[PDB]
Every structure is written in structure tokens, then in C-alpha cells.
Design a protein around this ligand. Structure first.
Ligand SMILES: *[C@](=O)([C]([N]C(=O)[C]N1C(=O)C([N]S(=O)(=O)[N][C])=[C][C]=C1C1=[C][C]=[C][C]=[C]1)[C]([C])[C])C(F)(F)F
Ligand code: NA
Length: 240
């Protein structure tokens, strides 16, 4: 997250750290959202390789041991059937990971609330992006969970010529674009928390930014629109 601030230790309990094993060590690669005690929602482009993964819940400081962490292995990975490995622009950037063991809920680990199917937010809706991604374009990962205020840019403006054009589809949510705050490498798959009816609901799965820079003006961070995938999510979960 570029231009963010460290989140409070129990502010976003549904945020998870998706890590892959390199050699003997583990390394954070993407974010994700706990949606069931044994299911995590993330971006398809995070779990596209045949890597060995683990999910860390109740995590705050990537390096230090906070004492609230639960590490569980990934048992099953279900990427959306229409996801094309190359294509972040084509859409369908969503995946569900079945955990090897159910996690224990407490104040540091909670389930994320999903929007009702089809829900579209009005322009400039208040949302926050969270993650341990790069704090600067070509910089390094954040040690502690970062958060940034990233209000929505409705599709009409986002899909215009001076923003993203046809790259952004109706099944995506745009947020930010002020040139100061944005998602960045390592934030992928994480949540876009939006305040709706007094409740923070997970409206997006962090997908992409401009390869020219993370915090590029008129290039808001783009997320997979969760509300467009409610039926798919429930079908997957009901089936396995
Ligand atoms: C994730 O943290 C980051 N996501 C990506 O880098 C996804 N991404 C892109 O943002 C682009 N941008 S583009 O070239 O401007 N296309 C519109 C291209 C490719 C990818 C991509 C695809 C497949 C695998 C990895 C990256 C954050 C910036 C959200 C991360 F690093 F992917 F995990
Ligand atoms: Na930690």
C-alpha cells in the first residue's frame, strides 16, 4: 500500500497473508480475505503457479511474532474457470482456497462480510485498501499491515479514455487514482473494505495497477467486484 498508515492490531481481522514456501522459508506474496473458517478468497493471479502455500491469520507484523497468528496449510485451490493466466485485464481474477484446518475466530481473526449480489457502489464511496504490499513503486514490503483511504471511481469515469478505458470491465471496482495512495505489489488478492449501511463489507479483491507505477494519477487501483461473483462463491463452497 503506497501512501497508507499502519492499521491498528485488530482493525481488519479478515485480512490474511498468503505465503509460499521458498526452500525452507516462507515468503508473503499476496493478501486475501477469510470468508469461512476454512475458506479464503484471493486473486486468481496469486495462486496460478504450482507453489506450496500457507495462510496466516491474526497477522500484524510480518517479521515479529505478534503472538496472535495461526498458520494453516492450503488444501484445495479453486480458481475461477474463466481465468486466463495472462489476463488481468480480461477479468475473473478470483480464487477460493480451502484451508487444511478451520481457524479459531477471536478479535484478531474474523470472517469478512460479503456484499449482496449485484450491489454497485456510488462514485466516491468510502473504502479502505489493506495489505503488506510495497509501500513505494519498486520499494519494499511493509513489515506491518498498512491501510489507505481509497474511495471508489465509478465505472463510467474509470472506463473513460483518460482513466483505464476498456481495460476495466463492469465486473471490476476502481478505487483511488489520486496519485498518492494505491495498492502495490504484494497487496494483490487482498480486500477493499467499503462502508455500507454502517458496516464494512469486502467489495473487492485487489487485482491490478499501472505497470508504469503503483500510485499513478488517473490510474486507480482495480479490484475484482465481489458482488458480481456471489453465486460462483456460494456454488464452489456448497460443492466442496
Ligand atoms: C499484486 O500484489 C499486484 N498486482 C499485479 O501486479 C497484477 N498485474 C498488474 O497490475 C499488471 N498491470 S498492467 O500491466 O498495467 N495491466 C493492466 C499486469 C500484470 C499483473 C500480474 C499478472 C499476473 C501475475 C502477477 C501480476 C498489485 C499491484 C495489486 C501482485 F504482485 F501481483 F501479487
Ligand atoms: Na507476525
Amino acid at each position: 500500500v503506497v501512501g497508507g498508515t499502519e492499521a491498528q492490531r485488530n482493525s481488519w481481522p479478515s485480512q490474511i497473508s498468503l505465503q509460499y514456501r521458498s526452500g525452507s522459508s516462507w515468503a508473503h506474496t499476496c493478501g486475501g480475505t477469510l470468508i469461512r473458517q476454512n475458506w479464503v478468497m484471493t486473486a486468481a493471479h496469486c495462486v496460478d503457479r504450482e507453489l506450496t502455500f500457507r495462510v496466516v491469520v491474526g497477522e500484524h507484523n510480518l517479521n515479529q511474532n505478534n503472538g496472535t497468528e495461526q498458520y494453516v496449510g492450503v488444501q484445495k485451490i479453486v480458481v475461477h474457470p474463466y481465468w486466463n493466466t495472462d489476463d488481468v485485464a480480461a477479468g475473473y481474477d478470483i480464487a477460493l482456497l480451502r484451508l487444511a484446518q478451520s481457524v479459531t475466530l477471536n478479535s484478531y481473526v474474523q470472517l469478512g462480510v460479503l456484499p449482496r449480489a449485484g450491489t454497485i457502489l456510488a462514485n466516491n464511496s468510502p473504502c479502505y485498501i489493506t495489505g503488506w504490499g510495497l509501500t513505494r513503486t519498486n520499494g519494499q514490503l511493509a513489515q506491518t499491515l498498512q491501510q489507505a483511504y481509497l474511495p471508489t471511481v465509478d465505472y463510467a469515469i474509470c472506463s473513460s479514455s483518460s482513466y483505464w478505458g476498456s481495460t476495466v470491465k463492469n465486473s471490476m471496482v476502481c478505487a483511488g487514482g489520486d496519485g498518492v495512495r494505491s495498492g502495490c505489489q504484494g497487496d494483490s488478492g487482498g480486500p477493499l473494505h467499503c462502508l455500507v449501511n454502517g458496516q464494512y463489507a469486502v467489495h473487492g479483491v485487489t487485482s491490478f495497477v499501472s505497470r508504469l507505477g503503483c500510485n499513478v494519477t488517473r490510474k486507480p487501483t482495480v479490484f475484482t467486484r465481489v458482488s458480481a461473483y456471489i453465486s460462483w462463491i456460494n456454488n464452489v463452497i456448497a460443492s466442496n
